[PDB]
């Protein structure tokens, strides 16, 4: 069946998804997956109405928050989950406003 258009997401979700996709790109141990995640992030970027500066600052927040270590019963580092936690964090939140 058909996928939703990017325009059907809220502006907030568009920014969150940018942050999440960009985080995935930073943690991916994969050149192809990194290129995919960054191309994906650039689609959310186009859809957003926020100024560039919001994204520039968010990228700094991302690099800082990615350093946090999380875990679970599995032996990995749960980075994929962390990407979502970061997108929805208080530190990213004010960058959702112009």
């Amino acid at each position: 069946q058909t996928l939703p258009d990017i325009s059907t997401f809220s502006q907030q979700q568009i920014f969150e998804n940018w942050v999440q996709n960009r985080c995935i790109g930073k943690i991916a141990d994969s050149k192809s997956l990194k290129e995919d995640a960054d191309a994906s992030a650039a689609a959310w970027l186009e859809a957003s109405n926020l100024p560039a500066e919001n994204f520039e600052k968010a990228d700094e927040v991302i690099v800082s928050l990615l350093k946090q270590k999380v875990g679970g019963t599995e032996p990995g580092h749960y980075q994929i989950l962390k990407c979502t936690l970061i997108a929805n964090s208080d530190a990213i939140r004010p960058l959702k406003s112009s």
């Binding site: 270590k69 999380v70 875990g71 679970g72 019963t73 032996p75 989950l81």
Partner: protein, 160 residues
């Protein structure tokens, strides 16, 4: 109104294997969801097996999400459900202590729940304790298997 310790220990041994092998044993919907990679945490599933075969059948209740094994019995797949379920069928815990250490459970045998923060996928771990070791891994303060888990409480019921 509690399972015998010897029988519980024996049942747990049969499922004291990795999650894929737990699925091979149980078959049915349990195996299907394990093989798909959807069920990763075998902990509530192991204890469901123990209870099912020690006279405390996992019920059909809206409170606790379950799937069936090939035995047509029910298995919980969320550890938070198994944690909530146990006091409703075992009664009030015999021991509930914060910052749990093994000495607090010396000379005791039964079912133990370690709860705490730091595991994103699990509020705790449910297992058996024989007075010296757990049936799989313990998660006391300082237990080597904790990883990011920080134990804040252990809750326990003696079995004879």
């Amino acid at each position: 109104m509690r399972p015998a310790f010897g029988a519980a220990w024996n049942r747990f041994k049969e499922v004291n294997v990795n999650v894929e092998q737990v699925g091979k044993l149980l078959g049915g919907k349990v195996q299907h969801n394990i093989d798909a990679g959807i069920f990763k945490n075998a902990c509530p599933i192991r204890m469901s097996y123990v209870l099912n075969y020690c006279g405390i059948p996992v019920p059909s209740n809206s409170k606790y999400a379950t799937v069936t094994g090939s035995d047509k019995k029910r298995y919980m797949f969320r550890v938070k459900d198994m944690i909530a379920f146990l006091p409703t069928v075992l009664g009030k815990a015999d021991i509930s202590v914060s910052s749990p250490t093994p000495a607090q459970f010396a000379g005791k045998q039964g079912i133990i729940i370690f709860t705490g923060h730091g595991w994103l996928d699990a509020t705790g771990h449910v297992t058996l304790w024989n007075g010296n070791i757990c049936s799989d891994d313990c998660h006391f303060l300082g237990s080597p298997g904790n990883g990011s888990f920080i134990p804040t409480n252990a809750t326990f019921w003696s079995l004879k």
